[PDB]
Design a protein around this ligand. Structure first.
Ligand SMILES: Cc1sc2c(c1C)C(c1ccc(Cl)cc1)=N[C@@H](CC(=O)NCCCCCCCCC(=O)N[C@@H](C)C(=O)N[C@H]1CC(=O)NC1=O)c1nnc(C)n1-2
Ligand SMILES: [Zn+2]
Lengths: 126, 376, 816
């Protein structure tokens, strides 16, 4: 079954605004969102309707760019590093769960190349 | 509307701008030629068929880029004896459309190629780095003169040509048979026996089953040659892998024509290859949305060639994602993935209409290497 | 394997005939072409007087007479089916008659698709060129001066690819043609002009029209009228400049005019002949218009009478007309000024025998002596008959049938013959009294297994239906004793006479296919068993079969029958039934079945030879070998346990082989071709037997006979290797001495030819060329035999002498 989704709006987590979080929202997230291979990575895997009951025995930390989007709009992250690690988590889940040469693995790989190209120009903290 | 069927034959998902080629090379019959083999291609190619390609590897890119200089023909081994990269026959493919891309540091080449000639493999050497050559002998084509040319009466030569075929039909063919095979009383065999080995009468009998699938079929959309007709009919029959090498081993169109007539009155229900017992479609739902027949070879965003069969209806499936209109094989439709509802195997897709009044409003497309043509 | 091929009866069908002043300027001649034989006569008041007879290394396709300016008599132009041309002149020195050749050469394009209407060859009325239509979209022109002694020609392109008929025209300053062609619009008549210097067609003297849809024949009227006559199927039209005259004779609507001849030198009258043996006269009415002008004014046709089915025609003199035929007998008729009581103007004078087309035969002995007799199934439609050839110069006898005989077999116990025949009936009503109808007893099959559920029920008006029959013919009086009529829409393809199991009775067994006009393949069939006793016929049992019975053989007390692809083998039980024993499913239809011992030979019409064997203890069939090569094949025969003989497309013969001591199992399942030969004719049936006295045979191992479409009968016998080498040397030595007419090479004639390849003959020795060793003079024999060795030791009889070889060839000739 699908688990409950990751929480949104946790008052106990500290936050601030930085140019890097703004860049990660206004440029990076929209850029990935606008991709032909983006569509599978936009919401939690819904294992009931997709009939994948073994997914969440293996995957205990679901994550997606929709969730990340809500976190950014709701100012959930403390720093750029946290988000870079979350994106890498998304990629790693795809390579762990699926097999080399599978369509979804090529799609994730395509997304990650551009992600790396983009992160190479993360601005210095103001 | 109508969905101009010349659209899928052009492969516009690959692009629009491509360099094109015109010059031709055909080798003599029963000569030995050494032709490079394109690796990782696992499919049976028939003369006259179209195969689209998307290459990424440096060995597959540097080869195709030196084909372009010399004669543009490589070799497609059937590979489908069983497996294990050992084949006895294959088809030469000639390149006519060529596009060279660039990506994140990677060279990509896009190619369209057409099947040219059949041959038999003699020697297969893996040379330099990953490119297998092939000694090969060109298999001849046999053109058989009509049966009554030998016993034709000299005074009956003038009355051989008939008036033009009318655009009812039951009378014309009887008149066709009575006059063409009149000189059958000079032999031991009756008139109707020579009609069973007649190239025209065998092409006309096959036609009376192809137009029943989809009913916009026209004569000029279909070859009048015995050879091109037989090859084009062989490339759209939903038959097993075994029978394809059987049709490619025949050197005469007439035996190929007669063989195809027997493969057409047997295959009814197509089932899931992995489960072998679950029904997907039948032969009643086949129809042709393309000028090449109900079955053609398409290519993937990642280079995975699929030979797809279009049908009106399909059962025993369930839907995975949401419709995706990008890189669609049939312009004007969006595909959602279909999988066997009982073993979750990849069966094919489902195409839905974009404009809210189109030729059909939905249809399914099934890959060849996922269905078992069984017997009901 | 080695073999020996020789012909017993020369071909008898006629494929061309011309008249003119060939032998001398004064005497009228009649020239006949019988496949490869040419005959020259002299027409007299009494009849025909033969003067000369020659053989040509080829099938004569075009034969015409012409006289260039400055020559005393006509010259003859010939073109064979391998595109070999010549010009021949008659020369008479002393009492010797020889035909001199004056110009020859091969006229064939390296690449090209041969036309669909055959070879056409015409000559200009002023003798300036020759026009040939061999390949589509081209026209060949030969200058006709004295220098062109190699027949050098050139091609002129055409924009019309469906030329039906073409003729030169009379009374034009420059050579003019006129041809009918077909385009998607229809049939039109055009005209051109041939320039020798430009080598290209100019514009035609008159303008193109829209001729009838079925126009096929072009006639070039002589000088006084000019122009051309177009004959189609419903009308006859005359074209010249602006003048156009057309008539619609209602009496020629029944059949199709296919041949013509000119009676009067000025074109006043013409003879016409249709398919069904009718003779017509076409008259041209002249007018003078006070201006010194002669113009046609009207056309009419008359029904002269009835003759044989005519392939050619020729008016000789005083109402004597020669009717050359292919399906029957050639005739000499006389035209009467006044009609007889029946209304015919035709009174038959002579008749010439013609055994073709032989569709079946059998060898029997009707006197229990040594010499055997051959009984064939000749002719077609109203010309059908039985021919009883006896060795006696062959002594042929004719038994008219007025039907189409198909199959023949002999029952020694009942002293009768079994014949499968067919008569054409119009929807039924018979057309003429057939041999089946004029029979003592009759029996019509009763349909219980056939409810005729599958039928079109489209019985039209006046459509033609075939009715088949089984005829019992006595072997002494040859009269018809019985007639059995098969069911409606029923064919009859096979027939066998044998006894099965442990019965002492001898039966007739027949296999049929229930064809229908709609389905392209039969789905029902029948096997029926007949016993003719004490002048009565009966049906003991019948077994319905799902398919068409193409063949039947008796297999050691069992019935081996082919049903489409199945090779089902049957049994005869005590309760008089047929019970299945074995099967063998195939990828081909078994049309030809031959049996020897336990092996079974299976073939289809596309030359897919197969070899099976019977396994007694297991009771099943197993394949031994196979050879597949797409081509057209006529018939097959079994020579030995290992060799198999057949006749393939383009008038060829081939023999396979089986290797029993092969090293591996790959070559133990393949048949190796060991013989190829261009016989020159269309073989249609093979039989074991002989006509000479039985025995009392060093170059002889089996004596297989065959019969052809042109009515030629030949013999093939196996041979020893030493003698095969000897005969190969004989042929090579004789070809240098023999001067062929037309200077054709013998190797080219006998080369295995087809539309694809052309390999020299191997494994076959031609006896016709060797038999000529005796006609030549003694110095010629000495030259042929000089420097040759033939004996068993003792220096090979030193220099082999001519006398040894002439004795050898006489012994060879003794076999027929
Ligand atoms: C809602 C969520 S969440 C989520 C998924 C979904 C739908 C997916 C999912 C899988 C694939 C893709 Cl692609 C997108 C999303 N799968 C689940 C797990 C799961 O069920 N796996 C078994 C998959 C079996 C069928 C594979 C068929 C591939 C061939 C093809 O269809 N290939 C295309 C490219 C093609 O060839 N297209 C043609 C058609 C045309 O017109 N032109 C073309 O090129 C999953 N795992 N992680 C995530 C996240 N998910
Ligand atoms: Zn399944």
């Amino acid at each position: 079954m699908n688990p409950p989704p990751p929480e949104t709006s946790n008052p106990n987590k500290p936050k601030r605004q930085t140019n890097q979080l703004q860049y990660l929202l206004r440029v990076v997230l929209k850029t990935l969102w606008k991709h032909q291979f983006a569509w599978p990575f936009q919401q939690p895997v819904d294992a009931v309707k997709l009939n994948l009951p073994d997914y969440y025995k293996i995957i205990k930390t679901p994550m997606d760019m929709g969730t990340i989007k809500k976190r950014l709009e709701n100012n959930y992250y403390w720093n750029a590093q946290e988000c870079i690690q979350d994106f890498n988590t998304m990629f790693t889940n795809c390579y762990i769960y699926n097999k080399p040469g599978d369509d979804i693995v090529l799609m994730a790989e395509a997304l990650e190349k551009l992600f790396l190209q983009k992160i190479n120009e993360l601005p210095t903290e103001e | 509307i109508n969905f101009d069927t010349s659209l899928p034959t052009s492969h516009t998902y690959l692009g629009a701008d491509m360099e094109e080629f015109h010059g031709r090379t055909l080798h003599d019959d029963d000569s030995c030629q050494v032709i490079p083999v394109l690796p990782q291609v696992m499919m049976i190619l028939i003369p006259g068929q179209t195969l689209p390609l998307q290459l990424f590897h440096p060995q597959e890119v540097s080869m195709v880029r030196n084909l372009i200089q010399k004669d543009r023909t490589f070799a497609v081994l059937a590979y489908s004896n069983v497996q294990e990269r050992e084949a006895q026959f294959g088809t030469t493919a000639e390149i006519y459309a060529y596009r060279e891309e660039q990506d994140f540091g990677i060279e990509i080449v896009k190619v369209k190629a057409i099947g040219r000639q059949r041959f038999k493999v003699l020697e297969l050497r893996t040379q330099s780095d990953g490119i297998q050559q092939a000694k090969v002998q060109i298999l001849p084509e046999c053109v058989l003169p009509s049966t009554m040319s030998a016993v034709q009466l000299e005074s009956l030569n003038k009355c051989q040509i008939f008036p033009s075929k009318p655009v009812c039909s039951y009378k014309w063919w009887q008149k066709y048979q009575k006059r063409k095979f009149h000189c059958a009383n000079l032999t031991s065999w009756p008139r109707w026996l020579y009609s069973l080995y007649d190239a025209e009468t065998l092409m006309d009998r096959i036609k009376k089953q192809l137009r029943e699938w989809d009913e916009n079929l026209k004569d000029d959309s279909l070859p009048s040659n015995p050879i091109d007709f037989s090859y084009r009919v062989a490339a759209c029959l939903p038959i097993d892998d075994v029978l394809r090498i059987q049709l490619l081993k025949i050197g005469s169109a007439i035996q190929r024509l007669r063989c195809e007539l027997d493969i057409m009155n047997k295959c009814t229900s197509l089932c899931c290859k992995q489960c072998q017992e679950t029904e997907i479609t039948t032969k009643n739902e086949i129809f042709s949305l393309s000028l090449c027949g109900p079955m053609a070879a398409y290519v993937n965003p990642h280079g995975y060639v699929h030979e797809t069969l279009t049908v009106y209806k399909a059962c025993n499936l369930n839907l995975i994602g949401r419709p995706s209109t990008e890189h669609s094989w049939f312009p004007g439709y969006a595909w959602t993935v279909a999988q066997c509802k009982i073993c979750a195997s990849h069966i094919g897709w489902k195409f839905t209409a974009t404009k809210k009044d189109m030729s059909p409003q939905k249809f399914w497309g099934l890959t060849r290497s996922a269905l078992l043509p069984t017997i009901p | 394997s080695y073999n020996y091929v020789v012909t017993a009866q020369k071909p008898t069908a006629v494929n061309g005939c011309v008249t003119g002043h060939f032998t001398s300027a004064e005497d009228l001649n009649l020239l006949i072409a019988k496949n490869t034989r040419l005959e020259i006569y002299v027409v007299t008041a009494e009849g025909l007087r033969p003067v000369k007879e020659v053989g040509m290394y080829g099938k004569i396709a075009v034969m015409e007479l012409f006289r260039p300016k400055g020559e005393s008599k006509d010259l003859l132009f010939i073109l064979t089916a391998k595109y070999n041309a010549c010009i021949l002149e008659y020369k008479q020195s002393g009492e010797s008659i020889d035909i001199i050749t004056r110009a020859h050469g091969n006229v064939q394009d390296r690449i090209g698709r041969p036309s669909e209407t055959g070879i056409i060859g015409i000559i200009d009325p002023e003798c300036r060129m020759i026009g040939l239509r061999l390949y589509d979209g081209l026209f060949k022109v030969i200058p006709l001066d004295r220098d062109n002694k190699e027949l050098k020609a050139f091609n002129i392109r055409l924009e019309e690819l469906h030329v039906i008929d073409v003729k030169f025209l009379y009374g034009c300053q420059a050579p003019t043609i006129c041809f009918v062609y077909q385009d998607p619009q229809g049939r039109h008549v055009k005209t051109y002009e041939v320039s020798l210097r430009e080598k290209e067609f100019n514009k035609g003297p008159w303008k193109q029209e829209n001729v009838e849809a079925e126009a096929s024949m072009v006639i070039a009227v002589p000088e006084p009228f000019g122009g051309a006559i177009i004959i189609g199927q419903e009308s006859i039209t005359y074209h010249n400049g602006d003048k156009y005259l057309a008539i619609a004779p209602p009496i020629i609507k029944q059949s199709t005019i296919v041949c013509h001849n000119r009676v009067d030198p000025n074109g006043s009258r013409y003879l016409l002949g249709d398919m069904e043996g009718r003779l017509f006269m076409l008259l041209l009415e002249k007018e003078e218009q006070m201006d010194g002008t002669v113009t046609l004014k009207d056309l009419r046709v008359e029904l002269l009478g009835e003759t044989s089915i005519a392939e050619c025609l020729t008016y000789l003199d005083n109402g004597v007309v020669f009717v050359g035929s292919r399906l029957g007998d050639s005739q000499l008729v006389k035209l009467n000024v006044d009609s007889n009581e029946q209304g015919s103007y035709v009174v038959a004078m002579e008749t010439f025998t013609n055994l073709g087309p032989i569709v079946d035969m059998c060898v029997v002995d009707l006197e229990r002596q040594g010499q055997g007799q051959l009984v064939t199934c000749s002719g077609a439609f109203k010309e059908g008959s039985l021919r009883i050839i006896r060795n006696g110069k062959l002594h042929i006898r004719t038994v008219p049938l007025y039907e189409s005989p198909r199959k023949i077999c002999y029952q020694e116990v009942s002293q009768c013959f079994g014949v499968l025949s067919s008569r054409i009936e119009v929807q039924t009503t018979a057309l003429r009294p057939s041999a089946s109808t004029q029979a003592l007893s009759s029996s019509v099959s009763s349909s219980k297994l056939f409810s005729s559920s599958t039928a079109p029920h489209e019985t039209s008006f006046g459509e033609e239906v075939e009715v088949h029959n089984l005829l019992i013919i006595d072997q002494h009086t040859f009269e018809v004793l019985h007639a059995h009529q098969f069911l409606q829409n029923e064919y009859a393809l096979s027939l066998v006479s044998c006894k099965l199991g442990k019965d002492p009775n001898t039966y007739f067994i027949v296999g049929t296919a229930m064809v229908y006009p709609e389905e392209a393949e039969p789905k029902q069939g029948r096997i029926v068993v007949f016993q003719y006793s004490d002048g009565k016929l009966q049906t003991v049992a019948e077994k319905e079969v799902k398919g068409a019975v193409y063949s039947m053989v008796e297999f050691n007390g069992k019935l081996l029958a082919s049903i489409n692809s199945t090779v089902r083998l049957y049994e005869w039980t005590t309760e008089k039934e047929l019970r299945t024993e074995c099967n063998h499913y195939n990828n081909i239809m078994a049309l030809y079945l031959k049996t020897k011992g336990d092996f079974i030979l299976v073939g289809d019409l596309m030359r897919s030879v197969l070899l099976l064997a019977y396994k007694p203890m297991e009771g099943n069939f197993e394949e031994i070998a196979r050879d597949f090569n797409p081509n057209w094949m006529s018939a097959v025969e079994i020579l030995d346990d290992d060799n198999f003989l057949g006749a393939e497309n383009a008038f060829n013969l081939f023999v396979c082989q089986k290797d029993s001591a092969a090293t591996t199992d790959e070559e133990r399942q393949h048949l190796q071709e060991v013989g190829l030969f261009h016989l020159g004719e269309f073989v249609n049936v093979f039989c074991h037997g002989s006509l000479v006295m039985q025995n009392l045979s060093t170059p002889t191992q089996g004596s297989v006979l065959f019969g052809t479409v042109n009515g030629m009968i030949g013999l093939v016998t196996s041979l020893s290797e030493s003698w095969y080498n000897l005969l190969l040397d004989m042929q090579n030595r004789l070809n240098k001495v023999i001067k062929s007419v037309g200077k054709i090479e013998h190797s080219f004639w006998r080369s295995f030819h087809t539309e694809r390849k052309t390999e020299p003959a191997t494994g076959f020795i031609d006896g016709d060329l060797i038999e000529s060793f005796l006609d030549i003079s003694r110095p010629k024999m000495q030259e042929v035999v000089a420097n040759l060795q033939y004996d068993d030791g003792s220096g090979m009889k030193r220099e082999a002498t001519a006398d040894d070889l002439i004795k050898v060839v006489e012994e060879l000739t003794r076999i027929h």
